[PDB]
Ligand binder design. Structure first.
Ligand SMILES: Nc1ncnc2c1ncn2[C@@H]1O[C@H](COP(=O)(O)OP(=O)(O)NP(=O)(O)O)[C@@H](O)[C@H]1O
Ligand SMILES: Nc1ncnc2c1ncn2[C@@H]1O[C@H](COP(=O)(O)OP(=O)(O)NP(=O)(O)O)[C@@H](O)[C@H]1O
Ligand SMILES: Nc1ncnc2c1ncn2[C@@H]1O[C@H](COP(=O)(O)OP(=O)(O)NP(=O)(O)O)[C@@H](O)[C@H]1O
Ligand SMILES: Nc1ncnc2c1ncn2[C@@H]1O[C@H](COP(=O)(O)OP(=O)(O)NP(=O)(O)O)[C@@H](O)[C@H]1O
Ligand SMILES: Nc1ncnc2c1ncn2[C@@H]1O[C@H](COP(=O)(O)OP(=O)(O)NP(=O)(O)O)[C@@H](O)[C@H]1O
Ligand SMILES: [Mg+2]
Ligand SMILES: [Mg+2]
Ligand SMILES: [Mg+2]
Ligand SMILES: [Mg+2]
Ligand SMILES: [Mg+2]
Lengths: 362, 362, 362, 362, 362
């Protein structure tokens, strides 16, 4: 029987069964609806929306970790269970995930629906970063979890999270996508459509990388070189991309490029550690775990180390952990946690919920 | 001596001397070449192309704010200086204008030519929207600059532009022209030629207006009424136009009519403001400046106010500024700026350019 | 001629002339610099930074009572004298204030600058809490002085301070501000910017209050009631705030909410008294003076009395003194002290300083 | 005019005018000086030192009947005349008192000061015990005079003192005070300060009593009973005292409790009588006069009788005289003596002194 | 079989088996409990609390030699026997230690628990100072025993303690720790946390020393010199400490620095000797034994000699004994005493106790 694990985040839905070592269904959190008049099914989800992307207007029900369009959200869950996993929801307890510091009501309504729409016998909502650490197999470390919608820092020491130093930025994969949509027009590549937004997403994933030394990377870039790469569009049009390959991901470190007043990840993580007790700090430095799909950028860990070692004390050893399959870290953690025998009492039982009411999930 | 100001945009070339309160030469950015065999001068520009429009194939060297046909572009500049303004280029520094977010290379090559072909001692390229604001005489406001080729929103606050919220659409005067060429065929008026495209341009300017309440405007239109207007073609053929008088300009607000997935101007401007800091927003709302010839449509400002006040907060005062001579706003701003004594150090000197190289203009 | 009194604290600069009953210049200790590229004056202070808050990055030169950014600090002093008070520094002796237990070097360098940059003929640095007591007009009492950067307890008996029982916490107005920036996101109000930090400051001052019975205040809060208040943002957006109105100021009493291991103010003050001689204690209890702008919270005095009477002996009369204009207490005291004829020998004369050297101020 | 009588002893200064039936000024022989840094008058005397006791370090210029700190001693005399009695010293002759067997130089210097500092026209120094007997109105009896600093036995028969049997112990009120400061820590009441020493003095005077049968008083004390008393400190702290109520005064009878090898008062007085002629003894037994403030303990006379009757012969009638106002006995005697017409030739005249020199007072 | 010796003092627990020449278990008397929410074992002792110090709130069950938190006290004893020594309590008689003049009830309850909780067949409580002398191997000397919680002087002559001259101060290692926590903020090192208190403890032990000539040590300190030392925090932050290295331990000699009215150790010890018989004094002077961990400060013995020789007579030889391993002196003495054959009758047998009752231990 076991249980279901559903990392219902922004961008991608990663779902499978608790106890498995990998998701069974990985697909976009996208709902598509016929842009053009048509009628010469007005509801496509995930891979459907992808395959018919050039007709549909693609929407993301979740933005910045927040479920905005609840109808579309429900729609996706429906597919997740009935069409993707092929499971009768009510036979399994469900583990959901959430980004720390989300609007309280987000979780409240989310779990409500699981109980009412899907008749899920029991459920639990876990903080994504916590699961990520748990996935790697550590009790101590600071988690830099950065995905499509949010970026956050959660410091955990020997099983104890330190809430007061949790950091959260809106810089994320989707912002990076849009930044390319902007700067590609410097060459003239008007990637202005939603379909093109998705194309650009593919461009990120294949061509972008993190500069180790941005200033000299730009100096290098000024000279014609290996930096220049070609890319094949769906219509056969070849795109030449150069500076943008690293100028885009650099915005994670220099947010002002996009327009954010906040500090870059380097300093954001640093500050999180600064807000923790001195006796803890050392261990956080030696256990800096990165996870989430934006950390899939080439050399992001190396650049991270470079700058955080500059920020920290010279006698402070810093180790960044880049556990491969970073992209699925949270889901993995969920699988583990749900299988854990000492986690069974953590399930909120429908009966219990019905008695207690919404508030119980917080 | 002073200087020259040249608003070399799409559709119209607006040129004159810095310090004047109006352009001296206003003519179409059109190059015409004998369509028919002929030979029973194969290069006509502006008013020439207009006067001989029924023979020539009329081309626009600039499209969507981008100089596409550089040979024809140069040709027009040649006439601008030598035949229109009657000026020996090299005696004056030249102010050029450009739509924000254009292909970097556009400006690069443009200025190259000014230095090499015309020996222009010095030059400067300014963003059109910026000049527009400057023309009205404000340091704060959001500029909705919409002309023949592009539509864009530039938010400026006390002299500081906010790049990250600049919006840009391809909806424009030329698109509107073509939309009429399409929908006039509903009655049967096959305006399919290039010559006819130009005729239709005239039709826009004289008969189109912006509906305040499109839905009831259509309901009104369903009944025979004052809406129906006659129009005289060059060959004496009378054209009857009704619904189209407002259905065409409505596409600026409902882009899907043409086929664009983007939001209408109402929401485009709104979103631009949303991306700006909350402390700024209020002033942007009370200083919404419209400029560019597409804003010459009757009641476009009133309709704009209607919808943006619907989008904004009920406690938010919104004022739309429609400074008459909107059509020449940018050029006016240029004249002012160039005359400004504290602008003289902004000129890029040929010597300086020759040393630095192309990149200096960015 | 008289003298100048300058309560150069964190958050607000309160300055005026000695002998006046109120400050002449009250403005924020803030330096603002253009966040965005700009240049489409890069130094704004106090009210300037406020008026242009949505462009500038606002920094506080002073943090936790410590002058961190000395260049910006000097900048503010410059404005204080030349633009705010309109006084030629060198014509007046200056009274400065300082929070007890500050880094020795803070005062050293501060006074150095007054002598060297501003040519101030003479000066004196007084402990803020001492002046506060002096302002109320008492020789005996314990001063709970709590402002933007620091909170401290100074026990004074018949003119004799008791150093060994001075308490000092980092809990302060600014921390409270940030706590709201955090907990408002429970509803979803992402007040994440610096501009928004300032907006939140305004929210504190208008909506926050101190719960008398926090536990039942929360129980009350659980039910929809009068607790819920609306707030108008600069962009017209209405914010609904409830629990947070008292959960924020409660952190002064339960520091762990923020993340501090220290005791709440109740016990902090109590402990200060415990460290004083038994023969003194009684009078300290009957003369508990509160001052500083954080004590402007509604009912903070009443709550204070409640808990301190619980902590103290049942036969011990406790009276909390909330002398209105608590917010300006220190400055007032300074005015009085400086006017005092028997205070004139306390001025450190530039000549004297030049001979003695820095150390003299301690 | 009359004269002044000044019982300048340890602990208390009892002064007034000769001829009065009571002292006009009764205050502590204490000089207080600001313990803490202060200066945020460094000389307080008597009631001043008491009122400001929690700041000042309280010192007793006199210890064990000996003037140790002469500067502080003079200080007190200054107040005695100028602030307390409001008398111009030089207008009156002064009667001083002294404990028998004091260091010769004590009297020498004391009287010197009266003549030189205060210009006292004439003076006389009387033995305290002698005056005490004189106060009661007897010519025969043995005087047990026991106060703050000394305890002594002076046997006088029909106006003739018997020097060779004068006894003197250092056991005294102050020692008893300190003994409580010690034994109260058995319960945990750390009365360790000087301020607390004074508090403990108050405790003595209100709660201590002399056990009649110490051994069974302890046996009684072992059972929870009426013995337990509460006491209110200046800070409202309630103190519970039991065994100590009589264990402290018992040390007068069992000096080893403190650490003295000498015999208790019972045997000390007994021995004094033993050293007197047999023909005298009987009358001494029937006239055992107790005086001095330590004899204010409840039941001390009764206990005294108990034990001295045990020590003496069974046929020997013993009567202990406890003339109420024992505490002021000496001063009273002084008043009487000074008013006595046949005492006027006993005054040492300044002229006489100036001729004779110091030695005259012995 | 032998016995167990447990020097259960404040700060450190020093335990081992009687007959051994050193403790087997030396660990902090600290109980730690998760400060932060946690649960993302709530009872850590000694080395556990140390290793997890940055999470836990560390408490000392014993303060000033008094067991305050009995539950935590018991907890530590539990670990002492079961986890540290690995001994089944009931198989051994236990020697406990206590600081002279402690609250009677402290010992009463302590021994109760040993009999009831741990079923200890027999026990004895010895005065710490006595054991210390015994450890050195002397019958005559004055013991200056100064540790984490208390400082006391016990004079013993040829096996006879002299109770009436036992001195006791609250000045101690912990007070010194806190004094650094205060004065380090003069440079700006806000060591305000409990974790930091412990860090500061380490700072004491490695950098503090006793000035021989404090006044000229300060004069020396005024000049930049070798006095300045660096220190490495757990987070790699380097701390520079100078004056504080000796200003902190100086408070043992000038208590007013902290805020105590009592005399410094120099005079405290001196006075103890003054209260002893003159025939004894000489031997006490030549046998001044120092013990307890606060006497581990560099040069404390030398400074002690300096000042006590100033206080004593010039013909009085003074020798201070600093028997290395001063820190474990008491425990050592206990081991010896317990092994002593003529000490076996001193054990209080559970049977005996059960008959007699609590009071027997006094
Ligand atoms: N292979 C890749 N290389 C670079 N970037 C990637 C890669 N894969 C994903 N990312 C991008 O960054 C985001 C990664 O998605 P993902 O980590 O699953 O976020 P999420 O956990 O699902 N959403 P959330 O945690 O709610 O913000 C997407 O926008 C991807 O475009
Ligand atoms: N009187 C008018 N009434 C309505 N529309 C007009 C009028 N005049 C111009 N427009 C139309 O809208 C466009 C206005 O031209 P114009 O503002 O000069 O654009 P531009 O600034 O020259 N080109 P650009 O800024 O590069 O997009 C032309 O297509 C005109 O047909
Ligand atoms: N009217 C108010 N109501 C509630 N809180 C206030 C009010 N006014 C000020 N405070 C807040 O608490 C702080 C008060 O400022 P203030 O007492 O002047 O501190 P300060 O004396 O200038 N700084 P310092 O003494 O150096 O910590 C600011 O953060 C205010 O937001
Ligand atoms: N009401 C009282 N009850 C018990 N003891 C008292 C009382 N009054 C005084 N004594 C105590 O015993 C001492 C009495 O003071 P007092 O008899 O005036 O001594 P003195 O004559 O002034 N000094 P001296 O004769 O020089 O030793 C003080 O220490 C008092 O605390
Ligand atoms: N190596 C050292 N150098 C300087 N000081 C030390 C050193 N070791 C210990 N002390 C300090 O002084 C105290 C010594 O501990 P310790 O002598 O064991 O006291 P204790 O006997 O256990 N407690 P107590 O006798 O009940 O007051 C601790 O606070 C230490 O920080
Ligand atoms: Mg995620
Ligand atoms: Mg234009
Ligand atoms: Mg203040
Ligand atoms: Mg007397
Ligand atoms: Mg010890």
């Amino acid at each position: 029987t076991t249980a279901l694990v559903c990392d219902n985040g922004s961008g991608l839905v990663k779902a499978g069964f608790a106890g498995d070592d990998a998701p069974r269904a990985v697909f976009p959190s996208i709902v598509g609806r016929p842009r053009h008049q048509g009628v010469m099914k007005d509801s496509y989800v995930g891979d459907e929306a992808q395959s018919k992307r050039g007709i549909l207007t693609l929407k993301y029900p979740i933005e910045h970790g927040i479920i905005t369009n609840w109808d579309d959200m429900e729609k996706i869950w429906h597919h997740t269970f009935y069409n993707e996993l092929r499971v009768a929801p009510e036979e399994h307890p469900t583990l959901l995930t959430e980004a720390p510091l989300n609007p309280k009501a987000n979780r409240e309504k989310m779990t409500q629906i699981m109980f009412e729409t899907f008749n899920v016998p029991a459920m639990y909502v876990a903080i994504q970063a916590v699961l990520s650490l748990y996935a790697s197999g550590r009790t101590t470390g600071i988690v830099l979890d950065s995905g499509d919608g949010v970026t956050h820092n959660v410091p955990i020491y020997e099983g104890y999270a330190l809430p007061h130093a949790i950091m959260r930025l809106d810089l994320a994969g989707r912002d990076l996508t849009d930044y390319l949509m902007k700067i590609l027009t410097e060459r003239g590549y008007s990637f202005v459509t939603t379909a093109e937004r998705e194309i650009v997403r593919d461009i990120k994933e294949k061509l972008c990388y993190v500069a180790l030394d941005f200033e000299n990377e730009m100096a290098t870039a000024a000279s014609s070189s290996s930096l220049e790469k070609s890319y094949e569009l769906p219509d056969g049009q070849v795109i030449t991309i150069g500076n943008e390959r690293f100028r885009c991901p650099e915005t994670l470190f220099q947010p002002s490029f996009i327009g954010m007043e906040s500090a870059g990840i380097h300093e954001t993580t640093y500050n999180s550690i600064m807000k923790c007790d001195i006796d803890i700090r050392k261990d956080l430095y030696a256990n800096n775990v990165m996870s989430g799909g934006t950390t899939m950028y080439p050399g992001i860990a190396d650049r991270m180390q470079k700058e955080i070692t500059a920020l920290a004390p010279s006698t402070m050893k810093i180790k960044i952990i880049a556990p491969p399959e970073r992209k699925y870290s949270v889901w993995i953690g969920g699988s583990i946690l749900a299988s854990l025998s000492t986690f069974q009492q953590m399930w909120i039982t429908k009966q219990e919920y019905d008695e207690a009411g919404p508030s119980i999930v917080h």
